[PDB]
Amino acid sequence: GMQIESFKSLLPKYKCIFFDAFGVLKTYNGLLPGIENTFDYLKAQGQDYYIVTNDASRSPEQLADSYHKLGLFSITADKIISSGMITKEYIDLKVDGGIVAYLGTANSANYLVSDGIKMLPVSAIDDSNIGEVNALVLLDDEGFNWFHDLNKTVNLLRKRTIPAIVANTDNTYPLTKTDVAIAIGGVATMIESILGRRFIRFGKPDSQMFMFAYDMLRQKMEISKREILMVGDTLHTDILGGNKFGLDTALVLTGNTRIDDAETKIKSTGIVPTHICESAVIEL
Amino acid sequence: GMQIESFKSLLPKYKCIFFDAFGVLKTYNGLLPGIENTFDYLKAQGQDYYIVTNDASRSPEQLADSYHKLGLFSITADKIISSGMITKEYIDLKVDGGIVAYLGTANSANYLVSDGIKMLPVSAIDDSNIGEVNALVLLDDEGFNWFHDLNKTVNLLRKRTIPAIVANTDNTYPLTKTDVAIAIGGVATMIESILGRRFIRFGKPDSQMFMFAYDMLRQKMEISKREILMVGDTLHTDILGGNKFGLDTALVLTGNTRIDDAETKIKSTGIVPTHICESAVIEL
């Protein structure tokens, strides 16, 4: 049996909320209806929050602009902790000049541009420049010819002893009510089905992003990890990750974990959320 | 230590040879030089042979035509036993009319054309005809847009309770001296990394093709399974497959199993060949 609790009822226990984005705040057809009231509410209550997301397809500033376009003005770039920030820091620290090859769009790659390094798509790599490729990043499922560039990526990683990096996204994402699409994490998975495990994956259920947020909160208040709530739709990323780091966790049913499957999934993985809620929408 | 034996020196022990094609008779740049003499030799000695191949991208007649183009005229379509034959028989028997969806080229699909069923590429499947799709076959890595149609195949299989069939090819094939290409079996492998295991795979190391050839030999001579030699470059398909069926096996070193790696791969898999030879090419 599941005890379903209202999200509003939980909020007084916590000094900060960590929200996953997809399946929690928004879905394939935009924001979940009413989700603005959640952020109005937290503001009115003076409650801190962050978005903690395994999206490295654009910068925090751009992720924040997408919410502003959808009308959620409360969410600023400083509130968005994304695994792309980890990737960027890893490249700056661990890659010594040359070229970083990427699978994705030019826009996805612009966030990573820096001094000393040239970003190039996999499509632009051949024998004439392969010796300068010092890393591979997988950023977005769109923006390149798969037949051409998945093939080239396989050969690039056979020929160059370099880090291959992706955000730990789900393997697929919902595109319509009926259809899913293969995500950038899934493109890595498919590559790894041919080559073996090979990708450094950043993001949940790792705890670096959580530690960053936690540290920033500790700079301005008394707070312990159990006084933070991680809110997510996915057991093996949001809930598992939150739990390992010591966060309380709330599973919402508006995403990857459907109500009919929750007990079964919880029982097969042994990943137990602190709380289960229908959704993160607070009714006005 | 490996005992390397001349292929010629083994031939007297055997009443029929089964040859894998790729890595044994031919490679990325055509026929292995001299392989013509092997076939001249077997004729002059009156020794039977078949080619037993997991290539289901063409009919046996077209597979034979490819050898004719390359100058190997003695290879006839009756000597080519291909996993595409199994696929064809499976469709005829187990699929009841409607549409068979495919990933490949129109030419790869032609061999499977039959009464009652329409072959269509996954690209031509939509809500208007999906309810009539009764099987999916993976035939060739070329001939379709991977971004579009790998996504559509994921969704097709999520929506239709139908058999998904592929030839059990290696996940990759050599394209040049340095580069490989993802093969149709590898495409299935990639799909399966997203969906889970889901493809019915035909061909080596299964034993149906062997049994078909064996039964034909038995109709014209006294022969036991150990009097047949399976010749291949791949442990987990040719050598494992042959051994399990009772055939003697000869590992050649002209393909997937490189000489520097043979002892290690043999030890790590426990797949032991009866004999190890440098190649299937016979001299003089």
Place this chain on the structure above:
Amino acid sequence: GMQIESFKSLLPKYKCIFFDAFGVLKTYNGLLPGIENTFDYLKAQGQDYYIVTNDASRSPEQLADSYHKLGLFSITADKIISSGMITKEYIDLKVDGGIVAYLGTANSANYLVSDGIKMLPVSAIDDSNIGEVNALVLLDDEGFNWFHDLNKTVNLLRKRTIPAIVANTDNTYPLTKTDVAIAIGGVATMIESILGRRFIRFGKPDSQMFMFAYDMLRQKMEISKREILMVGDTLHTDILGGNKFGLDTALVLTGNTRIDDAETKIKSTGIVPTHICESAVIEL
């Protein structure tokens, strides 16, 4: 969709029935009540049967004797086709003298012996004789010390280039209504989790036992693949194997596939039985 049919109604189409044993003829509770009616009916109708089983824990004669002890005298050793028989033949034809080491009971091992072979349990292997050990077979989850001999097995296979062989059983089997036990196939799975894929697996869904039965039947009568029904409770062994070999398949719901899960398991695997039936027990 999920259409259940009468098993008895199906049977006049066929000259021979192949039955899986566990979950079909019997469960942890012993014989399925009334299963004798089925065999009496087939005998009255002039229909043949064979048992096709991946239980290779004892000889066909002892497997038959175990039915006799339970009061089912219609099953005789000459009608039991066990994957143990493939193992025995492999040892005879593909292992050249020396020792064949085993995990199991002495009773499971000794009858596998043939001229030139010595069976030995793993517990008896040492530096002095490891050199003579020419194969490993896993026969029964009982009969050895797990701590000592799973460790010794791991080392044996790291040190010796030998085939490692097991019946393709499910990983676990029901002991009681609530509890399962790890089966011998599961022990192999566990070892492969440490070492990687390493075991030759005999039995369903491979075609070898099916071919043997079919060969024998065709000597005694005019029989096609259209006149043989394969009856099983497990999709990925019984149903998949039968389908690939060209047989009609009947999934029964007295074993691994429960009525409440059948539709979803068929959908997820894409393994579609020709017919679904509650039981292989007929009335009257």
Place this chain on the structure above:
Amino acid sequence: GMQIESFKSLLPKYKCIFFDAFGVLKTYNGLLPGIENTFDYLKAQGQDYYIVTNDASRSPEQLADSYHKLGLFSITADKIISSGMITKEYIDLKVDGGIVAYLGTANSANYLVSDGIKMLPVSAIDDSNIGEVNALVLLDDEGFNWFHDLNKTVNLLRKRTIPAIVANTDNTYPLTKTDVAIAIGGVATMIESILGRRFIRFGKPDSQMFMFAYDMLRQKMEISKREILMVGDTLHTDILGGNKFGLDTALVLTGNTRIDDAETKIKSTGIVPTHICESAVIEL
């Protein structure tokens, strides 16, 4: 390419060294000869150290005592960061009273003892106490009967929705020059081969222990991630974890990564250490 450097030459960059223990400070043969020099030198230079180890079979105090018994007094309990400490914290913060079941020895369970939870071995769990079991921990590959308690463990986890917890050890460890033993992490791996992924795994390559050490250091001094070197013998735990956390890494060749295999293993994994050294043992 593979450039070996002097370990001692590296050390002046750093304010603190994090050492892995097995394969770095000691092997199956005991302490690496001369390893005391290394700690003497760091102390002389005013440099700090911590041990960062996925050995959670004993408490930090017992782990330090084991060094003292071998004559290495420079390692003290307060400098040992063990993944056992994360397990302890997880049990305290996330497990609400009741029983914690364990696989291991009584001594290994001892440090986990707390006010509110009873420790009991899996062997002690039956129908009378099972509803009170609120977690399982795997602690040590010794101390239990594998046949009875691995079977019981599989049933325990099938029946109770509880977290299953293990240190992320390698699957095996060396006993002697020729033989390995299955480690506690490998036992979890085996269980997961039967049940599917099911264990929470603590330790490298996770960031948690790294974060702890760093948090402690930054209280006592001005220290950045650029002034900490992680030293280990295993790519997928030590080097990978160190790198993802933003640390310089040193691969040493005294343990799991041998000098003959380093270049190949680095190439296949894409896990690249900042530095490669023969040994953490310095001269003088």
